[PDB]
Amino acid sequence: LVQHEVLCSMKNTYEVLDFLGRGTFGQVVKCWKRGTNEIVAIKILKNHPSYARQGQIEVSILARLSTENADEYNFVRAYECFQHRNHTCLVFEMLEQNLYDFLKQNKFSPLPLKVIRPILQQVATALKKLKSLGLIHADLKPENIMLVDPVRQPYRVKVIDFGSASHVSKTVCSTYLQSRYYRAPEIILGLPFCEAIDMWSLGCVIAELFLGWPLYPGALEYDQIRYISQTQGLPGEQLLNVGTKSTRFFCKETDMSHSGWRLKTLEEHEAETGMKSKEARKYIFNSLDDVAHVNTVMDLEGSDLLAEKADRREFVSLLKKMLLIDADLRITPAETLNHPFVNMKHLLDFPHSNHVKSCFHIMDICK
């Protein structure tokens, strides 16, 4: 169960100092490595047989990632893995603050695109290495992207929480998987999924950093697929046909001139499940292009505004490619690093803008 005040390792030695967090399963606690000046995070896993298979596969993925010991691809370095009492725990490096707590303390104010760009490049590099190994993170949320040091190393991030990671398999998710606000349509509709469910999650977080609030903050999976379809259009017919959960949110309407699929109205869903659906979006978009026209009051003069408008033009261009409902056509982590928003090739067309001089400056410092 829960423990405190002291801990014991087989090869090293750790003394627990303060609790760090508690999830659905698996507790993380901050401790001090005795004999050194290092602070590390230890994630304990309860020794229940029904959770033993998920606990073992997480250790298998960390050992395969630890071969990439350089971790220049921005991963949390896993040190060792021992067993205390009858439980199995993992030792990670101690990062400072995750992106959600960074937005919370700033009253969820939007972040400029010049700060979003370094974070996007680092996470896309991580997902480029995850596809290189045939792995899925399956839990990419702002709570799982932590800043190494917000003051010493400004805007350097790493990804955490592999408790949902798994190898690529041709198996439909039986129920739910990723976090709801960042869940790909494949998991909602009951479709075969691969590594593209993290490209969808990365689109919902860079949009959350730009707006301050989640892009699709649906309380239920119906609200989630409703916001997506109302903003980006209904999913394709071939996708809704082979979708297992596709019948729980859509219906086969057949008028004289109607097509095949349509959404269940708020009146229909409220009668089917009894739950009245309320609006939770801070931003309602008829199109992803309306994201570029959000929060448009800046101090940028004519020289800098011509570039910020070009910056937003490429941000919604990448965001649309990252939020394509069809996972077969969704942009890949390798292509995202080659998108003009990350290449900054569209900012080169400006002779000397004092804003683009800072945009390029924030990028080459993240090293």
Numbering used by the authors: 184 to 550
List sentences from the manuscript.
HIPKs belong to the CMGC group of serine/threonine kinases and are part of the dual-specificity tyrosine phosphorylation-regulated kinase (DYRK) family. DYRKs are named after their characteristic dual-specificity, as they auto-phosphorylate a conserved tyrosine in their activation loop, but phosphorylate substrates on serine and threonine residues. HIPKs are regulators of various signaling pathways and involved in the pathology of cancer, chronic fibrosis, diabetes, and multiple neurodegenerative diseases. Based on a database search, we identified abemaciclib, an FDA-approved Cdk4/Cdk6 inhibitor used for the treatment of metastatic breast cancer, as potent inhibitor of HIPK2, HIPK3, and DYRK1A.
To determine the structure of the human HIPK3 kinase domain, residues 159–562 were expressed in baculovirus infected Sf9 insect cells. Crystals were grown in the presence of ADP and MgCl2 by the hanging drop vapor diffusion method. One HIPK3 monomer forms the asymmetric unit cell of the protein crystal. Despite its presence in the crystallization condition, no crystallographic density was seen for ADP or magnesium, implying that the kinase is in the nucleotide free apo-state. In the structure, a continuous polypeptide chain from residue 184 to 550 was determined for HIPK3, exhibiting the classical kinase fold as seen, e.g., for Cdk219 with an N-terminal lobe (197–278) and a C-terminal lobe (279-526) including a fully ordered activation segment. At the N-terminus, 13 additional residues preceding the canonical kinase domain are seen in the electron density map, forming an extended stretch in an antiparallel conformation to the β1 strand of the N-lobe. Another 24 residues are resolved at the C-terminus extending the chain to position 550 by two helices (αJ and αK) that form an α-barrel with helices αI and αE of the C-lobe at the back of the ATP-binding site. In our crystal structure of HIPK3, the conserved tyrosine Y359 constitutes the only phosphorylated residue. For HIPK3 instead, we find that the phosphate group of pY359 forms a 3.0 Å salt bridge with the side chain of R431, which is part of the HIPK specific insert region. The RYYR motif remains at the same position as in DYRKs and HIPK2, yet, R363 is hydrogen-bonded to the carbonyl group of G401 and R366 forms a tight salt bridge (2.6 Å) to E404. Unexpectedly, the structure of HIPK3 adopts an active conformation with a fully accessible ATP-binding site even though the kinase is in its apo-state.
